[PDB]
From a paper:
Glutathione transferases (GSTs; EC 2.5.1.18) represent a ubiquitous multigenic family of enzymes that conjugate the reduced tripeptide glutathione (GSH, γ-Glu-Cys-Gly) on a wide range of endogenous and exogenous electrophilic molecules. At the structural level, GSTFs exist as homodimers, the dimerization interface involving mainly hydrophobic surface patches. Each monomer comprises an active site region formed by a glutathione binding pocket (G-site) primarily involving residues from the conserved N-terminal thioredoxin domain and an hydrophobic pocket (H-site) primarily involving residues from the less conserved C-terminal domain. A PttGSTF1 monomer consists of an N-terminal domain (β1α1β2α2β3β4α3) and a C-terminal domain composed of α-helices (α4α5α6α6′α7α8) as classically observed in most GST classes.
The analysis of the Fourier difference maps of PttGSTF1 revealed the presence of two ligands in the active site in each monomer: a glutathione molecule originating from the pre-treatment performed with an excess of GSH and a MES molecule present in the crystallization buffer. They are located respectively in the G and H sites. Currently, we do not have any evidence for a GSH-conjugation reaction with MES nor data for any non-catalytic binding. Both glutathione and MES molecules were refined with complementary occupancies. Therefore, PttGSTF1 structure can be described as two structures: PttGSTF1 in complex with glutathione and PttGSTF1 in complex with a MES molecule. In PttGSTF1, a glutathione molecule is positioned in the G site groove which is mainly populated by polar residues from the N-terminal domain. The thiol group of the cysteine of the GSH moiety is quasi-equidistant to the hydroxyl groups of Ser13 and Thr14 (3.2 and 3.4 Å respectively). While Ser13 likely corresponds to the catalytic residue found in most GSTFs and is the primary candidate for GSH activation, the hydroxyl group of the adjacent Thr14 is found approximately at the same distance in the PttGSTF1 structure. With regard to the electrophilic substrate site, a MES molecule occupies the position adopted by other substrates in known GSTF structures. The MES molecule is surrounded by the hydrophobic residues Leu12, Leu37 and Phe123. Moreover, the oxygen atom of the morpholino ring is hydrogen-bonded to the NH and OH groups of Thr14 and the sulfonic group forms a salt bridge with His119.
Author numbering:
A (entry chain B), B (entry chain A): 2 to 215
The structure:
Amino acid sequence: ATPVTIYGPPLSTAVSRVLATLIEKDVPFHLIPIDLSKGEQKKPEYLKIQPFGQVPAFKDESITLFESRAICRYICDKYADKGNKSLYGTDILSKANIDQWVETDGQTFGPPSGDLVHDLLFSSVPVDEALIKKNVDKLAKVLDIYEQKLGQTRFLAGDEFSFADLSHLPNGDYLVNSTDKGYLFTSRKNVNRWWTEISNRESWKKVLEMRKNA
Amino acid sequence: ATPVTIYGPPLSTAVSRVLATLIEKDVPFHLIPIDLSKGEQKKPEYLKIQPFGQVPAFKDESITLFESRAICRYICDKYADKGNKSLYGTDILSKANIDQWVETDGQTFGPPSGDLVHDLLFSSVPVDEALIKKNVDKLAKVLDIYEQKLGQTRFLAGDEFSFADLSHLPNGDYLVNSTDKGYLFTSRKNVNRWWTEISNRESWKKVLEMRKNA
Ligand SMILES: N[C@@H](CCC(=O)N[C@@H](CS)C(=O)NCC(=O)O)C(=O)O
Ligand SMILES: N[C@@H](CCC(=O)N[C@@H](CS)C(=O)NCC(=O)O)C(=O)O
């Protein structure tokens, strides 16, 4: 079928989540730029597609979607028999087992890690060290629980890479490789192990290379 | 069939989300109390099933799950042909269409509404009115977008009540009925219509009565 259409820059964490999923699932795509520096996402034209004025948006022959994790669940559903077939499970039980850790990204890991990424890399107000520390300490608590989980299983939800792991890549990679807070991940033995395995997957390497290609 | 097991108090918003789903899906359940004021959610036996020391947790013969929205997706999947069949759609496209608004709850509406609910109703320290204002203003911006959407469709995702609407009930109901922030919903005519329709569903009324009697 025709390549799907993704709106937004690969530097965006939420866009990156979608891109990594497409690549894992062997789904071809067009990428339409949205210039965040020109406030393009906040103007009326883009608002028809993403009503919160955020990236990414998704369009294929059947539907227009927003919210990165919903886009990714759709892709995993539509293209279940394609690419990495086990990415979001293969039946009701394996899917749900992964999904609880996807929700842990969305509700538990994502808020402090995303706020850190924003405040340290993408904000225009002076960095507030007290606020950085607050979210560092919150994220440390989460990663302590991950350290124990990853002492039992190779990946968050079990023995194989899943969307739960994938969903951690965007904020993880900015913290580890673009801030001085990488020790949160790398000083925890099992988290470091996991982080190394997931960030060196072909799909993620391809996303990082796409960022270089502008 | 054997009733599923749910852990936590009905005063909890995340527990309420699961209860409303079970009732919509006509799934019998057994509810195991956890007293949050007494830290029962941190008892080591309970942390074995919910490692973040939060509620709810879910058990049936097949699986133990945490994170309310993951639990609800599993319920909707397992019991697709039961109760309200359309709650999370009936095929790939209708499911995804609902799911983007479920993610909007999780990522956009949920954080400011949940922080308001916590600071105003479940905090041990005084409220910070500057922070209240910050979250009120954030939520107002979200609801301005909903106001536009709900002028186009009856419910968030279309012409039928869905899990997307359901997922807004717990924080919405506390703000409308237990704080002086209800104007956020009631001053917006389409949002108010929607709120009226979804909060008067029998499933939601049953949850509130469970809570009143707990
Ligand atoms: N919850 C959304 C988050 C989207 C989001 O916040 N995107 C950022 C880039 S990572 C954005 O659009 N920034 C520009 C803006 O918010 O105006 C998702 O997962 O898709
Ligand atoms: N993202 C979780 C949220 C769980 C959560 O924060 N639960 C509250 C109840 S509203 C709780 O357990 N609070 C007690 C605590 O965190 O110690 C879910 O949706 O299940």
